[PDB]
Design a protein around this ligand. Structure first.
Ligand SMILES: CC(C)(CCl)C(=O)Nc1ccc(C(F)(F)F)cc1
Ligand SMILES: CC(C)(CCl)C(=O)Nc1ccc(C(F)(F)F)cc1
Lengths: 347, 345
């Protein structure tokens, strides 16, 4: 019997979704295959552990832990309640700066096996500019965009504003590079809104992307695995006004669906993901495809897109959770075996 | 006094360079201006703190190392033995196990102010493929290269080999993408050899780079800063043949030097560095410049290239160390301002 830890909470204003997701994951986990503990990180960095979750979590209130296994973070992560290391830890949260890739590094430093994306991949996917450069190199289609540092804008503003006029069609979005789904973002219908836009965004971030807007469907593909990933049929986030209602499979023609699946695997590769990614695309009325972004930590409730895309392939939510644990072990085992191969060559 | 920590040692095979480097850095810190603790990571992964280094370390043996205080990972990592929070922590080591970027993540999680590159820049510069894609986007010149995952070579070996034949001149080098300077690098003069080198590299990595080799001088530029970084004149290891004395400034045309300085600033930005990078170029006999890589954790003894390059600009080694501390504070304060502003919608 394997030992699992769910870490959730966070100081970031995603506390509640993190908690709901922990409840969803906790309730889809079979407790006779898995010995499960939880760690709740407050909006304070107080780490609170509860051991041996053996029963359905009837309420999200239950999971606002008031108490933890008093021990230090290190100790809380390096041994399961069963006395052995964890087989897999689920980081169901962003870095308590809203960051990704930070908790992964903690885990890596403590030699804790963990679910999902590694450090480079989780950090890569949270930086829109790095993400777009990786997709471009991979040959994935993207909408026109421009990027620059604050230092660049302050020196070459006229040049940069020219570049937007020459390359992008209004309306455009000004977006901070290094947030997730947050402030700083403004749709701009003209140059004067652009400049307001840049200034507001520079208040939260020193690096920006300006992207061309489009009228398109939001189409998403779930990818699962490590070295030989698989992509779901696409699903659609149905909305009458772009500014969860899911349609799975998406109403797209078959060649488009296939192209999307393949580009999802490509996106997953381009950012060197592990465990999973959700690839999010724009698909126009005329079936022009652009990749919008990958999401290394997608909504993961039982009713969320990523899990429901798998259900449609016949991978149920409990099985998806098990598959991600297995992937997590494989990846950890593989990294350690390679450490051994290298050490040995050194010797 | 401000409060500094140096973390050093680590599982990795850099263990003893890391120890020497702590020693150098320690002896370059003015103890009337700075209170200083150190944390040694043991080969087995254990953290051991030695508080309040107050004298010159004449010999590695005056460092407790494995025999410092047992240290769990916690919020306390923020805290000096003075009872003040650390102003800056030097991570003088690579990821004890994994990539680089890992102890940075840990510091990020624990809100520890740290010197040097952040998660994404430390990680992306330990990944040659990601580093090369970022260079390319910035318009930096690089030697022709191809890359692939194991899974792809397994499926498409013949096409991949043809690609090298088509796109690259031999000799070529086969490089694991991940970890630095280490195992699984081959020089390959023909296809028979390449296929051997690929096979051998995949024992240690799941992702490879194949580069066209060149005959070039290796030339380096140190950069220092956060948002308004500055680049040193370039330097070179003195060597009559290209297949430890340094020449700083390097023996190059002024204009080639200026171009390298600018390119270094560009490489710093391309990988979104903080604090510092050393940008390492190949310069051919006919002055063709190729960025080879950036190094987020460059040699940092008193005599290492990175500190010597700054010494030539008139920035002494202790001033270098102080500047890195100040940058680390500025950066940390800036993230604190941003998170505050972000969180306030
Ligand atoms: C929607 C979130 C609560 C945002 Cl972090 C979330 O954490 N999702 C998420 C976290 C972790 C993982 C996984 F653990 F599988 F890698 C998948 C999805
Ligand atoms: C030379 C090493 C021992 C290799 Cl990991 C090393 O750690 N160098 C180094 C580490 C840290 C820093 C900095 F503190 F600036 F980040 C600069 C240089």
């Amino acid at each position: 019997k394997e030992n699992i830890c769910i870490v959730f909470g966070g100081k970031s204003a995603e506390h509640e979704v993190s908690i709901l997701t922990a409840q969803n994951v906790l309730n889809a986990i079979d407790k006779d295959k898995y010995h499960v503990d939880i760690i709740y990180i407050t909006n304070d960095g107080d780490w609170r552990k509860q051991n041996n979750i053996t029963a359905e979590i009837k309420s999200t209130d239950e999971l606002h832990l008031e108490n933890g296994e008093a021990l230090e973070i290190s100790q809380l992560l390096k041994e399961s309640s069963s006395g052995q290391p964890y087989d897999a830890v689920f980081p169901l949260l962003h870095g308590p700066n809203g960051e990704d890739g930070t908790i992964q590094g903690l885990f890596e430093v403590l030699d804790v096996p963990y679910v999902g994306n590694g450090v480079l991949s989780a950090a890569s996917s949270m930086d829109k500019l790095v993400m777009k450069q990786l997709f471009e190199h991979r040959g994935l289609p993207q909408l026109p965009y421009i990027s620059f540092l604050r230092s660049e804008y302050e020196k070459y503003e006229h040049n940069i504003l020219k570049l937007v006029n020459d390359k992008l069609n209004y309306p455009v979005f000004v977006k901070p590079a290094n947030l997730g789904s947050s402030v700083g973002i403004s749709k701009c219908n003209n140059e004067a809104e652009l400049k307001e836009g840049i200034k507001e965004a520079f208040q939260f971030d020193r690096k920006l992307v300006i992207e061309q807007g489009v009228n398109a469907r939001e189409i998403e593909v779930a990818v699962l695995g490590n070295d030989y990933p698989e992509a779901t049929w696409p699903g659609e986030v149905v909305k009458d006004v772009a500014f969860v209602q899911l349609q799975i499979p998406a109403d797209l023609d078959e060649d488009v669906q296939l192209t999307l699946r393949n580009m999802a695997l490509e996106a997953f590769k381009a950012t060197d993901c592990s465990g999973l990614v959700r690839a999010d695309f724009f698909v126009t009325e005329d079936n022009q495809i652009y990749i919008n972004e990958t999401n290394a930590m997608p909504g993961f409730t039982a009713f969320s897109m990523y899990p429901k895309l798998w259900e449609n392939m016949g991978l149920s939510y409990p099985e998806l959770i098990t598959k991600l644990i297995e992937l997590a072990k494989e990846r950890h085992q593989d990294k350690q075996k390679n450490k051994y191969k290298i050490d040995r060559s050194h010797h």
